[PDB]
Amino acid sequence: PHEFCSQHTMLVKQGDDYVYLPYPDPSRILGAGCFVDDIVKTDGTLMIERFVSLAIDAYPLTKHPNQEYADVFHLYLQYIRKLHDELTGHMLDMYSVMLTNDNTSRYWEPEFYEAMYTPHT
RNA sequence: CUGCUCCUAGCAUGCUACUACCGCGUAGCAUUUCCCAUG
């Protein structure tokens, strides 16, 4: 369908055959990233799960024919990474201690996002 | 306000695996043992 619940339907190849993936408009995602209330996202170092949640809905933009949408997805990934590492520096240096296990690598590789659409859970 | 999802924490549940010692079951086993008159 051309549009349903503000989701554009795209058909791509997943696994061994083809399935439909609903992808959102890009402008809405970028606007939600840019403009917010105060402190809710005035400094993302305080709150990172926002962009994690945002990226999950931006994943089907990767399989789009035009590449700008994949660029948006990768931009979100890079920003998540930069936020996480700068948070690590801020916390480790001028405080005492942060890290014994990372467990946070997963949030910058498309393996975790793609599992969101795997027909098994 | 309804619906979906994520993360964290906690709780509780189930499951698995490990160790531990205990108890119980089982085998090998080392062991340590000597027969005699008669319807």
From Swiss-Prot:
It catalyses: RNA(n) + a ribonucleoside 5'-triphosphate = RNA(n+1) + diphosphate; a 5'-end diphospho-ribonucleoside in mRNA + GTP + H(+) = a 5'-end (5'-triphosphoguanosine)-ribonucleoside in mRNA + diphosphate. Inhibited by Remdesivir antiviral drug (GS-5734) through non-obligate RNA chain termination. Interacts with nsp7 and nsp8 to form the replication-transcription complex (RTC): nsp12, nsp7, two subunits of nsp8, and up to two subunits of nsp13. Interacts with nsp9. It comes from the Viruses. This is RNA-directed RNA polymerase nsp12. The chain holds residues 5201 to 5321 of 7096 of the full protein. Residues 8-121 are annotated as: RdRp Thumb. The gene is rep. Its cofactor is Mg(2+). RNA-directed RNA polymerase that catalyzes the transcription of viral genomic and subgenomic RNAs. Acts in complex with nsp7 and nsp8 to transcribe both the minus and positive strands of genomic RNA. The kinase-like NiRAN domain of NSP12 attaches one or more nucleotides to the amino terminus of NSP9, forming a covalent RNA-protein intermediate that serves as transcription/replication primer.
